[PDB]
């Protein structure tokens, strides 16, 4: 039986087939592992093989170098480190060769590279790997498939290996990563992979963001990537904008007004959930930040010293624009339930709530007008919106400021509790369930 054949039977629809292929490949790993890893790795490398087999092979390598279970993961990484060095050099090569020689899109090689780098970079046993990959991205004569395969591998390593293990090689990786995102880069498949690796590289790139020169460049490449017509990129591009807002709030005052604001706001409005959800996520992070900041401030006040860092009250500022966009998104509610299911609505709720606890004061006045106008609306959607909007701001604003509004609204509220709509009925239950638990 050629290995190719067994690899293939791991997808066979026949339940027996599946079985055999599985036990045969399971014994192999536990009884001829060095050989097994070499053959497999040889399969993965030959463009003459089927997407099916090439991929099955790759998986078998990954599943022998990593697990989701921490205890097994180490065991495997130990088992590998203790294999003959040459055999591991032989495998390390076929894998690394495969880069750029794959037809199918999700690179079966990338997983392998990370699965080994994860066990060898920490004991300096594969020092060629990083500079190598960095080159595949930076050599101009490099094929697109090369740059994509590689950028994906960089991403997995950036993702599965401790960030401290790459702090000394940040610069190189960042260059290669940003290279794949430049406007000039043709293939969006590459631009995607590159942007996806950048997301995991933020943790160990602090050095770079602190240098006004470089950071200024990164925000450009990221911002321009949010324009890429390939949605898939536009999403990952915003994903970085969000994670950055979190890690580098202090450096943002330069980009916030002249670009970030417009981008994220349009983002919260695209009909494409995947996108909207990211725009929302953005501000929800600004809030977490500006609240922790207000706390740090309240603590330095009781020390007679200015606070280390300072809020710029972006949330409080965008409040006039955020609220109407959020309340309206509370309209686009999915009729057949998406119960826990994270859609633009559920998120726009959580956000409004975060705003209310972040601007205990300024919030109520921007939301109220919407509530009053649509509380008695014929459309169950806009109605439910008003009901939710109200129950959202119930936490944060001074109790004294809320009590009058509660009481003067309690009538129509309790009535909504038995509204014809089954959705308004649950919402009205929640809002009322809050007006209690929050203030008897």
């Amino acid at each position: 039986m050629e290995l190719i054949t067994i690899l293939e039977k791991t997808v066979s629809p026949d339940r027996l087939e599946l079985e055999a292929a599985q036990k045969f490949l399971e014994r192999a790993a536990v009884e001829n592992l060095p050989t097994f890893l070499v053959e497999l790795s040889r399969v993965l490398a030959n463009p003459g093989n089927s997407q099916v087999a090439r991929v099955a092979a790759g998986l078998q390598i990954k599943n022998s170098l990593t697990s989701k279970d921490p205890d097994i993961k180490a065991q495997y990484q130990q088992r590998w480190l203790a294999i003959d060095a040459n055999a591991r050099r032989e495998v390390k090569n076929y894998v690394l060769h495969t880069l750029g020689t794959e037809t199918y899109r999700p690179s079966s090689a990338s997983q392998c590279v990370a699965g080994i780098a994860c066990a060898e970079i920490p004991v300096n046993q594969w020092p060629e790997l990083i500079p190598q990959l960095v080159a595949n991205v930076t050599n101009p004569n490099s094929t697109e498939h090369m740059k994509e395969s590689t950028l994906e591998a960089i991403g997995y390593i950036c993702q599965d290996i401790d960030p401290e293990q790459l702090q000394d090689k940040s610069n190189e990786i960042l260059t290669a990563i940003i290279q794949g995102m430049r406007k000039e880069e043709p293939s969006n498949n590459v631009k995607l992979a590159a942007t996806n690796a950048l997301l995991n590289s933020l943790e160990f790139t602090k050095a770079n963001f602190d240098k006004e020169s470089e950071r200024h460049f990164i925000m450009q490449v990221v911002c321009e990537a949010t324009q890429c017509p390939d949605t898939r990129v536009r999403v990952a591009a915003l994903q970085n904008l969000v994670k950055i807002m979190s890690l580098y709030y202090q450096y943002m005052e330069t980009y916030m007004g002249p670009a970030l604001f417009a981008i994220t706001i349009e983002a919260m409005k695209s009909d494409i959930d995947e996108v909207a959800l990211q725009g929302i996520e953005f501000w929800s992070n600004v809030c977490d930040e500006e609240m922790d900041l207000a706390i740090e401030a309240s603590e330095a006040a009781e020390q007679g010293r200015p606070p280390e860092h300072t809020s710029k009250f972006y949330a409080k500022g965008a409040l006039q624009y955020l609220v109407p966009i959020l309340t309206q998104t509370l309209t686009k509610q999915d009729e057949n339930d998406d119960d826990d299911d994270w859609n633009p609505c559920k998120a726009a709720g959580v956000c409004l709530m975060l705003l209310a606890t972040c601007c205990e004061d300024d919030i109520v006045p921007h939301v109220l007008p919407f509530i009053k106008e649509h509380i008695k609306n014929p459309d169950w959607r806009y109605r439910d919106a008003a009901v939710m909007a109200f129950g959202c701001i119930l936490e944060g604003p001074e109790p004294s400021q809320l009590k009058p509004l509660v009481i003067q609204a309690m009538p129509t509220l309790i009535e909504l509790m038995k509204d014809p709509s089954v959705v308004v009925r649950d919402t009205a239950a929640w809002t009322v369930g809050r007006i209690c638990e929050l203030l008897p």
């Binding site: 610069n171 260059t175 000039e184 020169s213 321009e224 330069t254």
Partner: peptide, 22 residues
């Protein structure tokens, strides 16, 4: 082809603004 250079992160140089761009 006279293809693009490559920005290097490493050795660089850190009454109105000259802000930011696209």
């Amino acid at each position: 082809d006279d293809s693009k250079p490559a920005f290097s992160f490493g050795x660089x140089x850190x009454x109105x603004x000259x802000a930011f761009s696209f």
